Design an enzyme around this catalytic site. Structure first.
Site, PDB file in Angstrom:
ATOM      1  N   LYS A  35       0.860  -1.175   0.000  1.00  0.00           N
ATOM      2  CA  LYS A  35       0.000   0.000   0.000  1.00  0.00           C
ATOM      3  C   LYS A  35       0.896   1.224   0.000  1.00  0.00           C
ATOM      4  O   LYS A  35       1.712   1.396   0.909  1.00  0.00           O
ATOM      5  CB  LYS A  35      -0.896   0.002   1.241  1.00  0.00           C
ATOM      6  CG  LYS A  35      -1.915   1.128   1.249  1.00  0.00           C
ATOM      7  CD  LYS A  35      -2.847   1.017   2.457  1.00  0.00           C
ATOM      8  CE  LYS A  35      -2.214   1.481   3.769  1.00  0.00           C
ATOM      9  NZ  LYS A  35      -1.778   2.911   3.736  1.00  0.00           N
ATOM     10  N   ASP A  63      -3.275   4.268  -1.735  1.00  0.00           N
ATOM     11  CA  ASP A  63      -4.127   4.616  -0.612  1.00  0.00           C
ATOM     12  C   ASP A  63      -4.347   6.119  -0.566  1.00  0.00           C
ATOM     13  O   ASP A  63      -3.777   6.818   0.269  1.00  0.00           O
ATOM     14  CB  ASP A  63      -3.502   4.124   0.692  1.00  0.00           C
ATOM     15  CG  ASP A  63      -4.380   4.392   1.892  1.00  0.00           C
ATOM     16  OD1 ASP A  63      -5.604   4.637   1.710  1.00  0.00           O
ATOM     17  OD2 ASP A  63      -3.852   4.361   3.022  1.00  0.00           O
ATOM     18  N   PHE A  64      -5.193   6.604  -1.464  1.00  0.00           N
ATOM     19  CA  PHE A  64      -5.397   8.035  -1.649  1.00  0.00           C
ATOM     20  C   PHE A  64      -6.693   8.533  -1.000  1.00  0.00           C
ATOM     21  O   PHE A  64      -6.947   9.734  -0.978  1.00  0.00           O
ATOM     22  CB  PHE A  64      -5.379   8.360  -3.144  1.00  0.00           C
ATOM     23  CG  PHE A  64      -4.021   8.220  -3.785  1.00  0.00           C
ATOM     24  CD1 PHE A  64      -2.901   7.906  -3.031  1.00  0.00           C
ATOM     25  CD2 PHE A  64      -3.877   8.391  -5.155  1.00  0.00           C
ATOM     26  CE1 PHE A  64      -1.646   7.797  -3.636  1.00  0.00           C
ATOM     27  CE2 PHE A  64      -2.634   8.282  -5.769  1.00  0.00           C
ATOM     28  CZ  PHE A  64      -1.518   7.965  -5.008  1.00  0.00           C
ATOM     29  N   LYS A  65      -7.503   7.616  -0.469  1.00  0.00           N
ATOM     30  CA  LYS A  65      -8.713   7.990   0.285  1.00  0.00           C
ATOM     31  C   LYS A  65      -9.504   9.077  -0.424  1.00  0.00           C
ATOM     32  O   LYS A  65      -9.861  10.098   0.164  1.00  0.00           O
ATOM     33  CB  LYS A  65      -8.365   8.398   1.721  1.00  0.00           C
ATOM     34  CG  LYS A  65      -7.713   7.273   2.515  1.00  0.00           C
ATOM     35  CD  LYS A  65      -7.552   7.616   3.990  1.00  0.00           C
ATOM     36  CE  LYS A  65      -6.982   6.439   4.750  1.00  0.00           C
ATOM     37  NZ  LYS A  65      -5.651   6.072   4.200  1.00  0.00           N
ATOM     38  N   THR A  72     -14.083  15.598  -9.800  1.00  0.00           N
ATOM     39  CA  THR A  72     -12.686  15.592  -9.401  1.00  0.00           C
ATOM     40  C   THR A  72     -12.230  14.173  -9.064  1.00  0.00           C
ATOM     41  O   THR A  72     -11.088  13.803  -9.358  1.00  0.00           O
ATOM     42  CB  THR A  72     -12.472  16.517  -8.219  1.00  0.00           C
ATOM     43  OG1 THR A  72     -12.759  17.862  -8.644  1.00  0.00           O
ATOM     44  CG2 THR A  72     -11.034  16.430  -7.701  1.00  0.00           C
ATOM     45  N   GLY A 183      -3.714 -11.688  14.715  1.00  0.00           N
ATOM     46  CA  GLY A 183      -4.599 -12.843  14.705  1.00  0.00           C
ATOM     47  C   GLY A 183      -6.073 -12.521  14.883  1.00  0.00           C
ATOM     48  O   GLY A 183      -6.925 -13.020  14.147  1.00  0.00           O
ATOM     49  N   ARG A 196       4.232   0.844  10.526  1.00  0.00           N
ATOM     50  CA  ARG A 196       5.344   1.119  11.442  1.00  0.00           C
ATOM     51  C   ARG A 196       5.985  -0.089  12.108  1.00  0.00           C
ATOM     52  O   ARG A 196       7.204  -0.116  12.238  1.00  0.00           O
ATOM     53  CB  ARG A 196       4.925   2.137  12.506  1.00  0.00           C
ATOM     54  CG  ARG A 196       4.834   3.558  11.967  1.00  0.00           C
ATOM     55  CD  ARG A 196       4.077   4.461  12.929  1.00  0.00           C
ATOM     56  NE  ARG A 196       2.638   4.192  12.895  1.00  0.00           N
ATOM     57  CZ  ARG A 196       1.748   4.752  13.709  1.00  0.00           C
ATOM     58  NH1 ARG A 196       2.136   5.596  14.660  1.00  0.00           N
ATOM     59  NH2 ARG A 196       0.459   4.449  13.581  1.00  0.00           N
TER      60      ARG A 196
HETATM   61  O1  LIG Z   1     -17.350  20.978  -1.715  1.00  0.00           O
HETATM   62  C1  LIG Z   1     -16.447  21.160  -2.531  1.00  0.00           C
HETATM   63  C2  LIG Z   1     -15.101  21.297  -2.139  1.00  0.00           C
HETATM   64  C3  LIG Z   1     -14.168  21.492  -3.129  1.00  0.00           C
HETATM   65  O2  LIG Z   1     -12.879  21.669  -2.808  1.00  0.00           O
HETATM   66  N1  LIG Z   1     -14.519  21.548  -4.454  1.00  0.00           N
HETATM   67  C4  LIG Z   1     -13.465  21.770  -5.462  1.00  0.00           C
HETATM   68  O3  LIG Z   1     -13.647  23.063  -6.061  1.00  0.00           O
HETATM   69  C5  LIG Z   1     -13.476  22.979  -7.501  1.00  0.00           C
HETATM   70  C6  LIG Z   1     -14.806  23.256  -8.205  1.00  0.00           C
HETATM   71  O4  LIG Z   1     -14.441  23.333  -9.580  1.00  0.00           O
HETATM   72  P1  LIG Z   1     -15.616  23.757 -10.596  1.00  0.00           P
HETATM   73  O5  LIG Z   1     -15.842  25.328 -10.563  1.00  0.00           O
HETATM   74  O6  LIG Z   1     -15.020  23.286 -11.983  1.00  0.00           O
HETATM   75  O7  LIG Z   1     -16.870  23.047 -10.300  1.00  0.00           O
HETATM   76  C7  LIG Z   1     -12.908  21.578  -7.797  1.00  0.00           C
HETATM   77  O8  LIG Z   1     -11.474  21.619  -7.764  1.00  0.00           O
HETATM   78  C8  LIG Z   1     -13.452  20.745  -6.622  1.00  0.00           C
HETATM   79  O9  LIG Z   1     -12.588  19.634  -6.349  1.00  0.00           O
HETATM   80  C9  LIG Z   1     -15.827  21.434  -4.795  1.00  0.00           C
HETATM   81  O10 LIG Z   1     -16.184  21.498  -5.965  1.00  0.00           O
HETATM   82  N2  LIG Z   1     -16.757  21.230  -3.843  1.00  0.00           N
HETATM   83  O1  LIG Z   2      -8.582   3.673   9.128  1.00  0.00           O
HETATM   84  C1  LIG Z   2      -7.469   3.670   8.609  1.00  0.00           C
HETATM   85  C2  LIG Z   2      -7.298   3.644   7.224  1.00  0.00           C
HETATM   86  C3  LIG Z   2      -6.017   3.637   6.735  1.00  0.00           C
HETATM   87  O2  LIG Z   2      -5.805   3.582   5.416  1.00  0.00           O
HETATM   88  N1  LIG Z   2      -4.929   3.639   7.585  1.00  0.00           N
HETATM   89  C4  LIG Z   2      -3.590   3.635   6.971  1.00  0.00           C
HETATM   90  O3  LIG Z   2      -2.959   2.395   7.289  1.00  0.00           O
HETATM   91  C5  LIG Z   2      -1.588   2.596   7.681  1.00  0.00           C
HETATM   92  C6  LIG Z   2      -1.420   2.260   9.175  1.00  0.00           C
HETATM   93  O4  LIG Z   2      -0.003   2.190   9.339  1.00  0.00           O
HETATM   94  P1  LIG Z   2       0.550   1.782  10.799  1.00  0.00           P
HETATM   95  O5  LIG Z   2       0.661   0.209  10.827  1.00  0.00           O
HETATM   96  O6  LIG Z   2       1.971   2.476  10.801  1.00  0.00           O
HETATM   97  O7  LIG Z   2      -0.280   2.290  11.922  1.00  0.00           O
HETATM   98  C7  LIG Z   2      -1.258   4.060   7.342  1.00  0.00           C
HETATM   99  O8  LIG Z   2      -0.803   4.172   5.981  1.00  0.00           O
HETATM  100  C8  LIG Z   2      -2.637   4.736   7.494  1.00  0.00           C
HETATM  101  O9  LIG Z   2      -2.690   5.917   6.695  1.00  0.00           O
HETATM  102  C9  LIG Z   2      -5.130   3.658   8.918  1.00  0.00           C
HETATM  103  O10 LIG Z   2      -4.202   3.630   9.708  1.00  0.00           O
HETATM  104  N2  LIG Z   2      -6.377   3.668   9.409  1.00  0.00           N
END
Ligand SMILES: O=c1cc(O)n([C@@H]2O[C@H](COP(=O)(O)O)[C@@H](O)[C@H]2O)c(=O)[nH]1
Ligand SMILES: O=c1cc(O)n([C@@H]2O[C@H](COP(=O)(O)O)[C@@H](O)[C@H]2O)c(=O)[nH]1
Lengths: 219, 218
Positions: A35, A63-65, A72, A183, A196
């Protein structure tokens, strides 16, 4: 579902290419699924995914959540899959249209979405916990097959497994550093995510081998 | 934060050449650019420094940070190292996750923008019902900068009420998503505009037109 070696996924959150490559290489005999999140990607570039594939031939979960509006979200998924990620994680709390946008790109591109339901940290209790059962149910309705849930709350992880069924794939972070037990977590999750406890170890390979020894009877 | 013309460009083009060209075309109208993951994941974090070198604009990294506190800290450090002036952070994951970002911002002389309610339809499912409490959480934590939705002016007005007139509030959803520039600026300090400018035949005219429509509010 993906066949994760030893039911163990490395959370590679080191932020330097040299250290990340070293540690990942050291544990490669134990782990075939890595990940990679924003700590490493924002530090070293999306080409780090390419380098990992070239060096280790491990599956990569980005893992970009993803947690934006649908338009977007689509862009983020497209860029991520273009770079070679096998799968991407997506938050459910922004609602169904946002999740569907990610699923649509994943379907088009032949990749996978992991839906993050309840999170593992204490703050998750404030808002996420109360929405998590419905987020999981939403995922089931949308046809989501892969899910993330918390090792730190066995009772919640068990409920999420119930909601998604035994056929869905469930991975679980919070093992080790955050207090979850490997486990016990594997009673419900298909695989554990460990960061970690492995990557900060004096000997990451021995740390991974130790975790695996402790769950040997579970595969 | 002093935003020129109360207008923030959401630069979500995914090609470096186009992003630089379009931003260049509207530079006379703005001094603040929001750069998100579409551009960053396509062209690299180095794009932030290049915007600063070329335009001198302030940069908000719209990364909607939404991880555990430990990971949030790392994301913020990486983002500020790349030269972002501010970062957006989701409030839904709770107070510890927000505090992690606030701590890094303080250490590095940057700002956190707390995202409260989002602008898209799906926001109604879970976010909307938590949004007032998220805003109060922001107030409790000492957050000074907030994001709320142009598409729901009654919700934007409530958010403004909670945070007070002294806090800074920016608002996306103007144009493409249906929000009105003038109405939004009744409550927000600045509007975020993406597609209505960057997908326009003539982005400069598009920005000029928006500013003309709100001229009495500047
Ligand atoms: O509630 C939200 C929060 C945001 O950051 N945005 C961001 O603001 C921008 C809106 O762009 P647009 O004017 O093309 O709809 C996008 O970059 C989007 O990710 C949104 O649209 N709504
Ligand atoms: O609920 C969540 C969801 C996650 O993706 N993570 C991700 O999983 C990893 C946990 O790593 P660690 O074993 O060091 O605690 C991190 O990359 C964290 O961003 C988390 O810890 N909790």
């Amino acid at each position: 579902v993906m066949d994760v070696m030893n039911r163990l996924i490395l959370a590679m959150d080191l932020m330097n290419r040299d250290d990340a490559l070293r540690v990942t290489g050291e544990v490669r005999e134990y782990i075939d699924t890595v990940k990679i999140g924003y700590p490493l990607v924002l530090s070293e570039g999306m080409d780090i995914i390419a380098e990992f594939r070239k060096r280790f031939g491990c599956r990569i979960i980005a893992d970009f959540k993803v947690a934006d509006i649908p338009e977007t979200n689509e862009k983020i998924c497209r860029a991520t899959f273009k770079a070679g990620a096998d799968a991407i994680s997506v938050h459910g709390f922004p609602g169904a249209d946002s999740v569907r946008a990610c699923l649509n790109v994943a379907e088009e591109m032949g990749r996978e979405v992991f839906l993050l339901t309840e999170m593992s940290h204490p703050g998750a209790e404030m808002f996420i916990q109360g929405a998590a059962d419905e987020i999981a149910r939403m995922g089931v309705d949308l046809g989501v097959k892969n899910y993330v849930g918390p090792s730190t709350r066995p009772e919640r992880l068990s409920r999420l497994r119930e909601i998604i069924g035994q056929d869905s794939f469930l991975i679980s972070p919070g093992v080790g550093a955050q207090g979850g037990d490997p486990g016990e977590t594997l009673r419900f999750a298909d695989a554990i995510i460990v960061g970690r406890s492995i990557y900060l170890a004096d000997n990451p390979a021995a740390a991974a081998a130790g975790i695996i020894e402790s769950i040997k009877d579970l595969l």
